[PDB]
Amino acid sequence: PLHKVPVGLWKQLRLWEGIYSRLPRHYLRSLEEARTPTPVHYRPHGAKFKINPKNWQRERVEDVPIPVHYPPESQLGLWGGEGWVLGHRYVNNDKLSKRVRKVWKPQLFQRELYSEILDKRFTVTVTMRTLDLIDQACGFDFYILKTPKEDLCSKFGMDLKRGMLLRLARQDPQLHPDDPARRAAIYDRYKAFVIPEAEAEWVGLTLDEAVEKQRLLEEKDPIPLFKIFVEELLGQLQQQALSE
C-alpha cells in the first residue's frame, strides 16, 4: 500500500479543498508565491560563474541561503528580517580542532518609533539593521510599505502594513479631523502604494486568521424550511394564475 498523492502536496490539496478554497484568489496567490528573502546574514556573490583559482576553469556557483531561526519574541518587534543563527564553528579558527555549537543572536534595542500615517509612537524592539533600513527607505511607513512579507518576517510589521493600507484605501478622516489639509498632505505622499479595499485587508493575515475571517464572513443562520415552502407555493400559484 502506497500513497497515491505524496505527502509533499497534502498542504496544497488541503488549500485547494475545504474552506481554504473559498478564500480570495489574490490572497491565495500571495500565499502561493515564494519569493526568496533578501540576504541579511550571508554575503551573496555577483556572477553565476566563477574561475576556480586552483583549477583555472569556469564553474557555476550557486548561492545557498543560510537557515535562520526566528524566536516568537521577534514577532513582537521589527528585527528587519533577521533572527538567531544556529550553527557550528571550529575553535581557534582551525579545521583540525574540535567542533562547537554556537548561537549568534542580534543585538536588540528598546526603541520608540513614531509613524506618520497612524500618528502613534510604538515602543518596538528594533535593531541597528532595522534602523539602517528605515533611514535608507527614508521613512518608517515607507520602509513598511516597500519591504514585503518575505523581508519583514514580522507579524507586527505585517499588521502595521495592513492597517496603513486600509487607512490609505478608506481615507479615514480620524487621522486629523482638525487639519484636513495636513491629512491630505500626508495621504498624497504615499499615493504610490494605494491598494483597493478588496485586497487591502488580506495582506497581513496568516492562514488561520484568514480562515477565521472567511468563516465569520460566511457564517449565516440556517434559513427555515417554512420560507422555502412558502416561496415554492407562491411560485406554483403564480404559474397556475398565468397559465389561465
Partner: protein
Amino acid sequence: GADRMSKWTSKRGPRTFCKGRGAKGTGFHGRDGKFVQIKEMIPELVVPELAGFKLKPYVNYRAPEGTDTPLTAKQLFLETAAPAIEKDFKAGTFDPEHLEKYGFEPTQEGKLFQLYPKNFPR
C-alpha cells in the same frame, strides 16, 4: 496491582470520593449544612386520565398495516398551512411581511417549549 479494565465507579474509591451513578440533581446545599430540595427541578410526571380511554396495548391481528411513509416537512406544510395560504392568496390578502398567523414563528424565545434550545426533555 490494581485493575484498569473495570469501570471506575463510586465503590472502588475512598470515603472522600462519592460519584453519582447518573441521577439528576434536584437542589443545592442550604445554610446549616442540610440539602434544600427545589420543587422546580424535580420532574413533575404529567399523566393523563386513562379511564375513558378506549385503547389497548395490543392491536387486532386481522387489522391491516400501512406503507412506511415517514412524515416530512413538506407534507406537514401541505397538510397544515398550504390551504390557508392558498385561500389568502386567492382572496388577495397574502402578506409576505407577516406569516405568524399560519403557524410560523420568527424566534423561539417567545414561547415556553422552544425547539432549537430544546427546553423540554421529552
